[PDB]
């Protein structure tokens, strides 16, 4: 794609300059492989792409252009396997998933 700015060479958006710094001044292990931050930036970009895609989808389905945290909870919790990765976490300012247990409805 390019030859400068090592993320350009892998053709990504997430930086491999910042990640490769943060894998050595974070004390995860002694010597960080030079392939390693690339693969790590590839996984991070993929998740940030997947969670921004389902967020944006639920923003047009509520007629709004930009994305507010209420959309991010709906993107995560309505998903089957992004909710499971984010199971214990709590998104600030981010509502609840609407559900009502069945016996609470009238009949």
């Amino acid at each position: 794609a390019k030859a400068k700015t090592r993320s350009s060479r892998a053709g990504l958006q997430f930086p491999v300059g910042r990640v490769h710094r943060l894998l050595r001044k974070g004390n995860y292990a002694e010597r960080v492989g030079a392939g390693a931050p690339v693969y790590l930036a590839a996984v991070l970009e993929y998740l940030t792409a997947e969670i921004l895609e389902l967020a944006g989808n639920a923003a047009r389905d509520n007629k709004k252009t930009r994305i507010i945290p209420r959309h991010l909870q709906l993107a995560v919790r309505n998903d089957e396997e992004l909710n499971k990765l984010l199971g214990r976490v709590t998104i600030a300012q981010g509502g609840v998933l609407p559900n009502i247990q069945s016996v609470l409805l009238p009949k």
Binding site: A1, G11, A49, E50, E53, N57, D61
Partner: protein
């Protein structure tokens, strides 16, 4: 199920965007729509309720977009000619 689709169309902007750099011009590389990276499997066949219907080939859940309606963009006057002409030929 809908995983692969959303990653399939993710590969199309992983390809098309590398060499669109000067031009530029629409030529079918203009994202090659939006609202298509979610479309569904859905087919058409002989309907129980009319000649031709549309069928969900996947167990789609509660509030989930199937398909955008596509066609021509025509104004209200030219609609009324077309609304009568097709019926004049009996569509």
């Amino acid at each position: 199920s809908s995983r692969l689709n959303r990653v399939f169309q993710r590969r199309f902007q992983q390809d098309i965007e590398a060499q669109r750099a000067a031009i530029g011009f629409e030529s079918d590389l203009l994202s090659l729509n939006q609202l298509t990276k979610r479309k569904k499997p859905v087919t058409f066949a002989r309907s129980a309720i009319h000649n031709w219907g549309l069928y969900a080939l996947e167990p789609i859940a509660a509030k989930e977009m199937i398909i955008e309606y596509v066609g021509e963009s025509i104004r209200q006057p030219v609609a009324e000619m077309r609304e009568k002409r097709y019926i004049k030929s009996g569509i």
